[PDB]
Short mmCIF file of C-alpha atoms and ligand atoms in Angstrom, two decimals:
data_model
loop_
_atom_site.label_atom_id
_atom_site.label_comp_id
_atom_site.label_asym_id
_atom_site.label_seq_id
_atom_site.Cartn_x
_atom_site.Cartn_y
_atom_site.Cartn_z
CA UNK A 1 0.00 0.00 0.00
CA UNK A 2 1.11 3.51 -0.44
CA UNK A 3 1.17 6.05 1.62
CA UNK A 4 -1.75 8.57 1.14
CA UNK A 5 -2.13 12.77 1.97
CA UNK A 6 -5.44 14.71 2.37
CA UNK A 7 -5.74 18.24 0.29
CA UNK A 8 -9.30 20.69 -0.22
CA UNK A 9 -10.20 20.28 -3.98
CA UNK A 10 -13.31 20.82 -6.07
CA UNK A 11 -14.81 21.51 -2.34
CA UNK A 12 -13.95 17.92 -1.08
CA UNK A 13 -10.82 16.57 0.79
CA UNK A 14 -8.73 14.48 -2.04
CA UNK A 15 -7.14 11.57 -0.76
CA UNK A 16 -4.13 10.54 -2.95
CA UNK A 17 -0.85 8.27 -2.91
CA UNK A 18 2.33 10.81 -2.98
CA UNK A 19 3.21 9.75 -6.40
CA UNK A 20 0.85 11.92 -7.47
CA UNK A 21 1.78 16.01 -6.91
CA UNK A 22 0.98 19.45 -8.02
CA UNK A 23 -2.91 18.69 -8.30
CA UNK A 24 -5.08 21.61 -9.96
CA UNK A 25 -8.94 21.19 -11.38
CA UNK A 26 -9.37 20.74 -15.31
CA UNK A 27 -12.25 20.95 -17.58
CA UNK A 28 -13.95 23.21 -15.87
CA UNK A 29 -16.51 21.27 -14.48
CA UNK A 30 -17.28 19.40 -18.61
CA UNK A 31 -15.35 16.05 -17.29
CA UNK A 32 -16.63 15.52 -13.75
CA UNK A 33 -14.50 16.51 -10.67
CA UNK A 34 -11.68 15.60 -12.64
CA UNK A 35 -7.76 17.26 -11.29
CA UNK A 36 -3.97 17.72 -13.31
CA UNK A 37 -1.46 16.14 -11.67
CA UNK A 38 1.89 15.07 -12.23
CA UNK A 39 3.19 11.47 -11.90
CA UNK A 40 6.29 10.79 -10.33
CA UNK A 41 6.75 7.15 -11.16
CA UNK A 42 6.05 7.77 -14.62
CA UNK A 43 6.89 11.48 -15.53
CA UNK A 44 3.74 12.10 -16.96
CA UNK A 45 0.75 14.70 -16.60
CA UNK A 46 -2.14 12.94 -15.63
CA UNK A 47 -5.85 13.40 -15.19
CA UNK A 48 -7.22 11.97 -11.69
CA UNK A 49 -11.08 11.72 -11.44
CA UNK A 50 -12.95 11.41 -7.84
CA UNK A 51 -16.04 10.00 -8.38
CA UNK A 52 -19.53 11.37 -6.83
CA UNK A 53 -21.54 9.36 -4.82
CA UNK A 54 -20.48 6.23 -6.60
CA UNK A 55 -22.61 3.77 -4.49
CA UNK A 56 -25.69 6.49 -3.81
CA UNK A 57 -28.17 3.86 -5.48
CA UNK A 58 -28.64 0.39 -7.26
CA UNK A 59 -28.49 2.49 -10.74
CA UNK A 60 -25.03 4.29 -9.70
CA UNK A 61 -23.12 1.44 -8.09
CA UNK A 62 -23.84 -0.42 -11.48
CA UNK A 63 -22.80 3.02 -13.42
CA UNK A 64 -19.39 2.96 -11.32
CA UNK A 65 -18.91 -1.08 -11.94
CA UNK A 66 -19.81 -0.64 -15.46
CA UNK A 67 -17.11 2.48 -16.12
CA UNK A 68 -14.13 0.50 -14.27
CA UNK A 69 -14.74 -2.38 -16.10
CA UNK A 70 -14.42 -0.81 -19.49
CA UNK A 71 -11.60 1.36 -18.67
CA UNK A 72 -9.71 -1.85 -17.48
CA UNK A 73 -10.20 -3.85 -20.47
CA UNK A 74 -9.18 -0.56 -23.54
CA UNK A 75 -5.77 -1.74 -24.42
CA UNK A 76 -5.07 0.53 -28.42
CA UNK A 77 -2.94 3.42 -28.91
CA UNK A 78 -6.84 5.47 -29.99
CA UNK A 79 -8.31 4.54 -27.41
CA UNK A 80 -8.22 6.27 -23.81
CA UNK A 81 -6.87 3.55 -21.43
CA UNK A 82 -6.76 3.00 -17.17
CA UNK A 83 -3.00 4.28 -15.95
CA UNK A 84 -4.01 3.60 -12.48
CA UNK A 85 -7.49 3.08 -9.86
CA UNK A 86 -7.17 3.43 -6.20
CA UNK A 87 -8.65 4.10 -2.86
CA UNK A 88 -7.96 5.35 0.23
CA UNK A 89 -10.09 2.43 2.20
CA UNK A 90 -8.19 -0.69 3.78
CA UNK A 91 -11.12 -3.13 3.16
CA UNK A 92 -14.26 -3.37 1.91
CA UNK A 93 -15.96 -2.29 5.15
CA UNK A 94 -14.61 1.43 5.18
CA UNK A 95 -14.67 1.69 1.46
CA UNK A 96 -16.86 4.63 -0.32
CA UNK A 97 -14.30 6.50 -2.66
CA UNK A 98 -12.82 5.64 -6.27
CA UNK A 99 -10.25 7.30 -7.87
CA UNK A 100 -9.56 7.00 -11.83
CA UNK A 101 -5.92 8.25 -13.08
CA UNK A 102 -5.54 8.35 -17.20
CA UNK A 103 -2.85 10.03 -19.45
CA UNK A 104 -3.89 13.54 -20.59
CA UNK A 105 -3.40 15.13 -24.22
CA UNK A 106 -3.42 18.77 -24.82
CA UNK A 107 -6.51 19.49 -26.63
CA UNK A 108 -9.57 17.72 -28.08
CA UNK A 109 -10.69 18.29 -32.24
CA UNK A 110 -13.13 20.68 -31.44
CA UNK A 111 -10.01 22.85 -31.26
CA UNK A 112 -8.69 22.15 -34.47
CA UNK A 113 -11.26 22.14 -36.61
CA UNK A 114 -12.45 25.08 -35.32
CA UNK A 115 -8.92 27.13 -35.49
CA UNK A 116 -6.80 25.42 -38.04
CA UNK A 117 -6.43 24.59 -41.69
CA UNK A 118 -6.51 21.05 -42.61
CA UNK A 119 -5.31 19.13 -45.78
CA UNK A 120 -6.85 16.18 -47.03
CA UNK A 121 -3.93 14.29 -45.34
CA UNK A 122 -4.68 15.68 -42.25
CA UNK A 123 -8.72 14.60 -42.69
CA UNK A 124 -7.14 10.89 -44.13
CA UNK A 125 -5.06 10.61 -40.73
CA UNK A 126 -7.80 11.79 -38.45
CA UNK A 127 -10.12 9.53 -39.30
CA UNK A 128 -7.87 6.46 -40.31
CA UNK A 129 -6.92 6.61 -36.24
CA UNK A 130 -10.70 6.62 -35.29
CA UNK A 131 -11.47 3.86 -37.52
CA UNK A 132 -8.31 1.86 -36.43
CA UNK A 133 -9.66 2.81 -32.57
CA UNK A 134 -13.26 1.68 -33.79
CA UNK A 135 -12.15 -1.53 -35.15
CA UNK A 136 -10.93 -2.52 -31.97
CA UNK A 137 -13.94 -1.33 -29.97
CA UNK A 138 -16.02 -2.91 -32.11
CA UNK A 139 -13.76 -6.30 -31.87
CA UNK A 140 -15.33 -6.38 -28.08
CA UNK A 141 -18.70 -5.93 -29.06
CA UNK A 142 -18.86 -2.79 -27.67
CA UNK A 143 -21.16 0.25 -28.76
CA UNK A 144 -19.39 3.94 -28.28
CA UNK A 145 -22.99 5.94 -28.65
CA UNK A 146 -21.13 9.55 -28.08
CA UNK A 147 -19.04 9.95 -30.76
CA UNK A 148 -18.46 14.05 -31.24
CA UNK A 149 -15.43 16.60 -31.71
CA UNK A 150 -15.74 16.98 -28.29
CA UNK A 151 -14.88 13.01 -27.05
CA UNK A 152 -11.60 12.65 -29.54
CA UNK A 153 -8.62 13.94 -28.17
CA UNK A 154 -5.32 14.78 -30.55
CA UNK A 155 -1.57 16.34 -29.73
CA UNK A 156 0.59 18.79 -31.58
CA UNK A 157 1.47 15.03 -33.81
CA UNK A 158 -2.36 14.70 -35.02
CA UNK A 159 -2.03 11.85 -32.70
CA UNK A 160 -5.71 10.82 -31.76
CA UNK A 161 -7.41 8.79 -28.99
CA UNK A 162 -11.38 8.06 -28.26
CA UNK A 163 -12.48 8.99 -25.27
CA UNK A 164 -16.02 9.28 -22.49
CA UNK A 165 -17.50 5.90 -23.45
CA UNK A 166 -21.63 6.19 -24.07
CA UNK A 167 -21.83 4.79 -20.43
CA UNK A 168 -25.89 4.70 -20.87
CA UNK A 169 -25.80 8.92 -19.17
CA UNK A 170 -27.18 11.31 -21.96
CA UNK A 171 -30.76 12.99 -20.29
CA UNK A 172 -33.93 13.96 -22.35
CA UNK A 173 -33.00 17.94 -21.45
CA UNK A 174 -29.42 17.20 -22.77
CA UNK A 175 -30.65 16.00 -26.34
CA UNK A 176 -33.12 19.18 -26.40
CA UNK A 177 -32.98 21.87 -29.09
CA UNK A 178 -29.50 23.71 -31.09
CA UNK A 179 -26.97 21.40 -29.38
CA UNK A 180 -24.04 19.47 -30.22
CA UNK A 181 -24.82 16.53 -28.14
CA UNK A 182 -27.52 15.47 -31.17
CA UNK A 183 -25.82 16.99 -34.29
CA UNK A 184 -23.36 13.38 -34.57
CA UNK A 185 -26.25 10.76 -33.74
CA UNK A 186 -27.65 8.30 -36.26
CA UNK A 187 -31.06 8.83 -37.28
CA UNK A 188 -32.42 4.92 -35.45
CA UNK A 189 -31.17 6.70 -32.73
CA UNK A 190 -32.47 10.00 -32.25
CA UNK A 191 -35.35 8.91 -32.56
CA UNK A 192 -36.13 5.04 -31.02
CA UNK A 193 -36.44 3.84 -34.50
CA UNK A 194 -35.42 -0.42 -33.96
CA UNK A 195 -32.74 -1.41 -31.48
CA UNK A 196 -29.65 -0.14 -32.54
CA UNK A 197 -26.05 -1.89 -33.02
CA UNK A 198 -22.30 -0.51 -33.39
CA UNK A 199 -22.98 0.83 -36.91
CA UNK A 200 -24.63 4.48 -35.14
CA UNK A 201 -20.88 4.88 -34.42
CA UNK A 202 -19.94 4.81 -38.14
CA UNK A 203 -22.96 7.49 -38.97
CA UNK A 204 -21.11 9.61 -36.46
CA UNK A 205 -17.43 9.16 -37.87
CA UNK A 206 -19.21 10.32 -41.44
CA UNK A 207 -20.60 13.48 -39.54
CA UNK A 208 -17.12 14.11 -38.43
CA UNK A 209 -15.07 14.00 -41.38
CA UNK A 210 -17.78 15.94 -43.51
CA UNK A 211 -17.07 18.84 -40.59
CA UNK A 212 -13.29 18.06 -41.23
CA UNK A 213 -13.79 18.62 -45.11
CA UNK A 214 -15.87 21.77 -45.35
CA UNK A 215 -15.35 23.33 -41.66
CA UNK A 216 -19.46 23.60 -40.62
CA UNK A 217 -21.58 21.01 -38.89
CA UNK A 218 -22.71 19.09 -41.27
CA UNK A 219 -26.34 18.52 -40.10
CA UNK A 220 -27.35 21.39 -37.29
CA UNK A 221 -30.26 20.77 -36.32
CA UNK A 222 -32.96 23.18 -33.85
CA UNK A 223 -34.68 20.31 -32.66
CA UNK A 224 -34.98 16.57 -33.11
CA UNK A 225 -37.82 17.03 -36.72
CA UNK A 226 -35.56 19.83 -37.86
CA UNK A 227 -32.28 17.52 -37.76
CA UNK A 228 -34.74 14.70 -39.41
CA UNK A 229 -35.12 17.50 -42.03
CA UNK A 230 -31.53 17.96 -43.05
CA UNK A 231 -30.66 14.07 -42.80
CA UNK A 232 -33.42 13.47 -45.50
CA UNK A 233 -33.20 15.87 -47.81
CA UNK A 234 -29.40 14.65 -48.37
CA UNK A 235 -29.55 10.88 -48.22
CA UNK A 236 -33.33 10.75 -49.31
CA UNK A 237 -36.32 9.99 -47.88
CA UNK A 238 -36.51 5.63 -46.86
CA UNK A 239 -37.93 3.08 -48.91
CA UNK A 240 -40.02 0.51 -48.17
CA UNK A 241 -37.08 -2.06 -47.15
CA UNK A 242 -35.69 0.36 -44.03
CA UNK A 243 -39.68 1.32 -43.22
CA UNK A 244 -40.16 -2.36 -42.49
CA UNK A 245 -37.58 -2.12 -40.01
CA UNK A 246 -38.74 0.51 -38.26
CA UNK A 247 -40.63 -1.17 -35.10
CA UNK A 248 -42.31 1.44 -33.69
CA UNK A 249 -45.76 2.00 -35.96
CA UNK A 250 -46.17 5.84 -34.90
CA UNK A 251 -42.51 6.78 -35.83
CA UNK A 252 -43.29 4.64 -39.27
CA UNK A 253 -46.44 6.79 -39.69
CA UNK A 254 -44.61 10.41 -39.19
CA UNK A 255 -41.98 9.48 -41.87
CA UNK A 256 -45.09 8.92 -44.64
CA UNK A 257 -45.94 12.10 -44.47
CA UNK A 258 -43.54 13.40 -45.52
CA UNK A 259 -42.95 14.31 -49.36
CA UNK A 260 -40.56 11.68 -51.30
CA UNK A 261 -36.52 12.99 -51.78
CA UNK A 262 -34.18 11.18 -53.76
CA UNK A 263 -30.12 11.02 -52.45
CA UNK A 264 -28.15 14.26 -53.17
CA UNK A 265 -25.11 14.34 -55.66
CA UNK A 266 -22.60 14.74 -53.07
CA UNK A 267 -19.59 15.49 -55.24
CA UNK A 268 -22.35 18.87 -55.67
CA UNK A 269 -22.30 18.85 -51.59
CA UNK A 270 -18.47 18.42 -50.73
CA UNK A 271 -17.20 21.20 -53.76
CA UNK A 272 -13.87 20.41 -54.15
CA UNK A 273 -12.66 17.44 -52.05
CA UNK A 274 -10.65 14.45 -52.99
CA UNK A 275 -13.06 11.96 -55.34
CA UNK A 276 -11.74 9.05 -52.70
CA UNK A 277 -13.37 10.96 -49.25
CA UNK A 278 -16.42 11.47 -51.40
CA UNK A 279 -16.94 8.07 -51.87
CA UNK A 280 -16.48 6.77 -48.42
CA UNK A 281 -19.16 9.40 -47.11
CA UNK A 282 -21.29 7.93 -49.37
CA UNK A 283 -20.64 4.72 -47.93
CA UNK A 284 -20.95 6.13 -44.21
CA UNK A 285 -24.16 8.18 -44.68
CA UNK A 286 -26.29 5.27 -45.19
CA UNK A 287 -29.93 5.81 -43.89
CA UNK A 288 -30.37 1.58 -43.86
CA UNK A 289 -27.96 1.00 -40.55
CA UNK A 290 -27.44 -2.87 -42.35
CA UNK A 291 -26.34 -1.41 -45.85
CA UNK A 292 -23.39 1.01 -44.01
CA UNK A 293 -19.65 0.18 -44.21
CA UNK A 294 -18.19 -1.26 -40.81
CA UNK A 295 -14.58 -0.66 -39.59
CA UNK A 296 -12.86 -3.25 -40.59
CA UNK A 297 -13.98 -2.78 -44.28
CA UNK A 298 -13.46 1.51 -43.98
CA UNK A 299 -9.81 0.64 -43.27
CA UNK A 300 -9.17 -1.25 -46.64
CA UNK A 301 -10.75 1.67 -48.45
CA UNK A 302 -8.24 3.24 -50.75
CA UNK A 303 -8.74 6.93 -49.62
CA UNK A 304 -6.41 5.83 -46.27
CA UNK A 305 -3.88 3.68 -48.53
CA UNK A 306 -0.99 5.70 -47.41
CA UNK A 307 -1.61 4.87 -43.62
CA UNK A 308 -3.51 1.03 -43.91
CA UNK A 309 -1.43 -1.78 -42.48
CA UNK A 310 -3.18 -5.03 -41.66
CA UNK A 311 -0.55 -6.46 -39.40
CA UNK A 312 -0.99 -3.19 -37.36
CA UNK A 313 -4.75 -3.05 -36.89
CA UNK A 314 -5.29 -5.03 -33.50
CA UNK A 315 -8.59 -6.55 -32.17
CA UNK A 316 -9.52 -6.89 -28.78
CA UNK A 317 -9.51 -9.39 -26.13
CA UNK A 318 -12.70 -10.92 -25.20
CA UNK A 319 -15.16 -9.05 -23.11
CA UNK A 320 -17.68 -10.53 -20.47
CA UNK A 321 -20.79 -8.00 -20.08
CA UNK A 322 -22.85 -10.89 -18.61
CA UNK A 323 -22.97 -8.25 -15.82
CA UNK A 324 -25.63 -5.48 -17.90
CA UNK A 325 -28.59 -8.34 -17.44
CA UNK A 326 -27.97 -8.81 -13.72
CA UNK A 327 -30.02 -7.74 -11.33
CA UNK A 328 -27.92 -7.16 -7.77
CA UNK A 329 -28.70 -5.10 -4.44
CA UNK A 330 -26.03 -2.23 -4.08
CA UNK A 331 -23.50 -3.82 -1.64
CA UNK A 332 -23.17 -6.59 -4.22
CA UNK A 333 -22.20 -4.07 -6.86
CA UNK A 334 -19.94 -2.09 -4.48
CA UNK A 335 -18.13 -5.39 -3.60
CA UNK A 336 -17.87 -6.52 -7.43
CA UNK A 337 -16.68 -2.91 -7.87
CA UNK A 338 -14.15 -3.28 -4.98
CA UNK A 339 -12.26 -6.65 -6.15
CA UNK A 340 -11.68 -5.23 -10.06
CA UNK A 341 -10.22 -1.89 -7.76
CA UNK A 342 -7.83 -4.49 -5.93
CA UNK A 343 -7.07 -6.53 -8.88
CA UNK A 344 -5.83 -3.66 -11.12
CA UNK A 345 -2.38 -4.42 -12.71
CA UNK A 346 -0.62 -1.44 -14.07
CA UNK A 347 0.64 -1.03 -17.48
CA UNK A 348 4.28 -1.53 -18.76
C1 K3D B 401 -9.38 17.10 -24.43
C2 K3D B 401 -8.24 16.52 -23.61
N1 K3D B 401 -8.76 15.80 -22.45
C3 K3D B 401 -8.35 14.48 -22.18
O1 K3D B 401 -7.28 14.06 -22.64
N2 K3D B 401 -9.22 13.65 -21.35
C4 K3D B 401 -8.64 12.38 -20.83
C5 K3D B 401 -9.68 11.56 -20.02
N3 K3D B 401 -10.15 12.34 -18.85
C6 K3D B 401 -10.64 11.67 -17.69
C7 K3D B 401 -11.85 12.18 -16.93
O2 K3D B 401 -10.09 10.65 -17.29
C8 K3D B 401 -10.78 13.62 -19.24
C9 K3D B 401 -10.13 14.38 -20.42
CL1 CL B 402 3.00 6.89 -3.77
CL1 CL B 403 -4.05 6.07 -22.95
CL1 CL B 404 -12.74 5.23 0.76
CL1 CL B 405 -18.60 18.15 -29.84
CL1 CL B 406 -14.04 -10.06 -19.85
MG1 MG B 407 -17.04 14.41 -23.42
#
């Protein structure tokens, strides 16, 4: 065990191991009560989040045992990983606090495609690394859900990682009106169409590197109908093949009335950019989630054939989530939560 020392941050006495110095908030509130610190085993800056009332119900403790697990198993150079988990407690009895620790990058692509000029190499290396980091995620049959500017984090290299995991959070009020926490979802989505698989996350990488390409949001909607609005009128209005598929009768109903659109020319859309990036947004911006391009085939598209390496595009380990259909009082989950805390081996 190391040895631990009490200081007053975010309004709360932080309890850390002394490898960890110089703490100071970060974010601003966006990531939780998240601190910078540095790391004096491993000389880097770090990010160390205190969680809030981890254990306050059944619906929390499983939120807490839910994040730890995934942040233990992401293992990719895209993909945000666990540097360290502690607590202060010396057994399960006096335990109530969980700290996460992960590396920190400098800025996230909100603030470089809002303030910088990008080539077509730059939008081919972007999103080669999210695909690459998708590919793996996928591998573990796990759904991201969030993708945005906002969740991909990049360094002075155009070095990129995924990061804040769709851990089930996003509230009715958060997904209301001109916001950015919509603009990226896939339409099945948005709006309860059919249960959903990992192919919203590929309408969301398309969303992205349109905004890379031409520098504006590429569907900003006012509301929930408007956003339908600008979906349809460039990838056309659904035929009777996707309407089948859409389970709920009322939502089938709402998209009849409205007046037929054919599919937009989008070399006419995207003036000007490479043929190649054309063509895979075509292939992205499916409306038919079961007719889009997955990962693994995006990589092998010839658009990223200067960066595409197939010994160098890893899959991931198994994952159990056995645990999402369980249903278990809160001390169970706090004690499940407890052992993967106490089991937690760090990286090389
Ligand atoms: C835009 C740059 N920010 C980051 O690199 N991340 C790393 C992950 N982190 C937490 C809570 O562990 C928050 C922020
Ligand atoms: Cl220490
Ligand atoms: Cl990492
Ligand atoms: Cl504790
Ligand atoms: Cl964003
Ligand atoms: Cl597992
Ligand atoms: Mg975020």
């Amino acid at each position: 065990r190391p040895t631990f020392y009490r200081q007053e941050l975010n309004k709360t006495i932080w309890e850390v191991p002394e490898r960890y110095q110089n703490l100071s908030p970060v974010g601003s509130g966006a990531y939780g009560s998240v601190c910078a610190a540095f790391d004096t085993k491993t000389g880097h800056r770090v990010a160390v989040k205190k969680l809030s009332r981890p254990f306050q119900s059944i619906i929390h403790a499983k939120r807490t045992y839910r994040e730890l697990r995934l942040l233990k198993h992401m293992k990719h150079e895209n993909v945000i990983g666990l540097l360290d988990v502690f607590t202060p407690a010396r057994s399960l009895e006096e335990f109530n606090d969980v700290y996460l620790v992960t590396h920190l990058m400098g800025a996230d692509l909100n603030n470089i495609v809002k303030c910088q000029k990008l080539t077509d190499d730059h939008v081919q290396f972007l999103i080669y690394q999210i695909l690459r980091g998708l590919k793996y995620i996928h591998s573990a049959d796990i759904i991201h859900r969030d993708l945005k500017p906002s969740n991909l984090a990049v360094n002075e290299d155009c070095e990129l990682k995924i990061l804040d995991f769709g851990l089930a959070r996003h509230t009715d009020d958060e997904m209301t009106g001109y916001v950015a926490t919509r603009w990226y979802r896939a339409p099945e989505i948005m709006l309860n169409w059919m249960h959903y698989n990992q192919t919203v996350d590929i309408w969301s990488v398309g969303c992205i590197m349109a905004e890379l390409l031409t520098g504006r949001t590429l569907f900003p909607g006012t509301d929930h109908i408007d956003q339908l609005k600008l979906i349809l009128r460039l990838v056309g209005t659904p035929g009777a093949e996707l309407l089948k598929k859409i389970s709920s009768e009322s939502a089938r109903n709402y998209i009849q009335s409205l007046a037929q659109m054919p599919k937009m020319n989008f070399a006419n859309v995207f003036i000007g950019a490479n043929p190649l990036a054309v063509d895979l947004l075509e292939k992205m911006l499916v409306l038919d989630s079961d007719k889009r391009i997955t990962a693994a085939q995006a990589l092998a598209h010839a658009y990223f054939a200067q960066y595409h390496d197939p010994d160098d595009e890893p899959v991931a380990d198994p994952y159990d989530q056995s645990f999402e259909s369980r249903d278990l009082l809160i001390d169970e989950w706090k004690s499940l939560t407890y052992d993967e805390v106490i089991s937690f081996v760090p990286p090389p």
